[PDB]
Design a protein around this ligand. Sequence first.
Ligand SMILES: *[C@@H]1O[C@H](CO[C@@H]2O[C@@H](C)[C@@H](O)[C@@H](O)[C@@H]2O)[C@@H](O[C@@H]2O[C@H](CO)[C@@H](O[C@@H]3O[C@H](CO[C@H]4O[C@H](CO)[C@@H](O)[C@H](O)[C@@H]4O[C@@H]4O[C@H](CO)[C@@H](O[C@@H]5O[C@H](CO)[C@H](O)[C@H](O)[C@H]5O)[C@H](O)[C@H]4NC(C)=O)[C@@H](O)[C@H](O[C@H]4O[C@H](CO)[C@@H](O)[C@H](O)[C@@H]4O[C@@H]4O[C@H](CO)[C@@H](O)[C@H](O)[C@H]4NC(C)=O)[C@@H]3O)[C@H](O)[C@H]2NC(C)=O)[C@H](O)[C@H]1NC(C)=O
Ligand code: ZN
Ligand code: ZN
Ligand code: ZN
Ligand code: ZN
Ligand code: ZN
Ligand code: ZN
Ligand code: ZN
Ligand code: ZN
Ligand code: ZN
Ligand code: ZN
Length: 210
Amino acid sequence: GGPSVFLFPPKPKDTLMISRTPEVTCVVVDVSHEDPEVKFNWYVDGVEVHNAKTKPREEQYNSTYRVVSVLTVLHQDWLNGKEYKCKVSNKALPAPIEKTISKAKGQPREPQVYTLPPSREEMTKNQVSLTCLVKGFYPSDIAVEWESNGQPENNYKTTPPVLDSDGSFFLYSKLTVDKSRWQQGNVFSCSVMHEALHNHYTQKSLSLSP
Ligand SMILES: *[C@@H]1O[C@H](CO[C@@H]2O[C@@H](C)[C@@H](O)[C@@H](O)[C@@H]2O)[C@@H](O[C@@H]2O[C@H](CO)[C@@H](O[C@@H]3O[C@H](CO[C@H]4O[C@H](CO)[C@@H](O)[C@H](O)[C@@H]4O[C@@H]4O[C@H](CO)[C@@H](O[C@@H]5O[C@H](CO)[C@H](O)[C@H](O)[C@H]5O)[C@H](O)[C@H]4NC(C)=O)[C@@H](O)[C@H](O[C@H]4O[C@H](CO)[C@@H](O)[C@H](O)[C@@H]4O[C@@H]4O[C@H](CO)[C@@H](O)[C@H](O)[C@H]4NC(C)=O)[C@@H]3O)[C@H](O)[C@H]2NC(C)=O)[C@H](O)[C@H]1NC(C)=O
Ligand SMILES: [Zn+2]
Ligand SMILES: [Zn+2]
Ligand SMILES: [Zn+2]
Ligand SMILES: [Zn+2]
Ligand SMILES: [Zn+2]
Ligand SMILES: [Zn+2]
Ligand SMILES: [Zn+2]
Ligand SMILES: [Zn+2]
Ligand SMILES: [Zn+2]
Ligand SMILES: [Zn+2]
């Protein structure tokens, strides 16, 4: 029938750290050998731009060609809602294919970050759960990590964002540590990246209070 276009956003962390390079990815699949030519046009807010890096086509094991084009986006443009259009032209199509993407839309809402110590009843266990509540944020793109003086604490798991009853999102992150480390008074820190925080970052700390 005709080829199909997919347009993918940057990775969320790449949009929240100015040191990183967010990029948007236009993928064309189902390109026939009969008309194998593929032209990309990129627009930012309706204005054609020219810095996209297209990859040379690559044949698939199902006898179709796959062509990829990558446009780097500016940290501030993406956060300011600019919209990115990929236009794919190929002989086999009646009219060119237009896909548009941007950051999740909606008024931004800054998260409230709260650490919760292990439950009393959980103090019987050889491991305990440190809880980071992140609530009230909009949009849902977010990243959460845990640290203890310098090094990342990676035995943690974070729930997906959940739509709350006021239209904002919340989640929880659970860090599991040896009960000894928690009682040795060590400081544990939940750090949160989200667009609506100052510099898109905050951290909150948790320690035994005796
Ligand atoms: C012939 O073969 C080719 C490929 O060869 C095959 O290789 C694999 C795939 C084998 O399975 C086998 O087939 C062959 O060996 C086939 O090509 C495939 O075609 C199908 C369509 O038929 C495509 O399906 C869509 O996939 C989307 C998800 O794709 C991602 O995830 C899958 C794995 O789950 C991967 O396979 C893909 O490569 C994609 O991976 C993502 O790619 C991004 C770009 O690289 C990554 O982002 C980038 O990441 C880098 C670092 O890695 C940087 O961070 C960059 O900054 C960043 O931009 C991303 O991380 C990566 N993810 C992963 C996990 O790797 C689906 O989203 C899509 O769903 C759409 O369609 C469904 C129904 O059609 C439905 O669920 C939805 O409606 C959805 O539609 C979109 O949804 C939105 C919102 O809901 C709506 O608005 C729209 O409806 C719609 N719009 C848009 C714009 O999307 C499809 O399921 C498949 O991806 C593609 N494969 C490849 C490799 O390209 C071909 O079909 C075969 N043909 C025949 C006839 O056999
Ligand atoms: Zn031009
Ligand atoms: Zn050009
Ligand atoms: Zn931009
Ligand atoms: Zn950005
Ligand atoms: Zn945007
Ligand atoms: Zn649009
Ligand atoms: Zn980090
Ligand atoms: Zn603030
Ligand atoms: Zn400042
Ligand atoms: Zn910024």
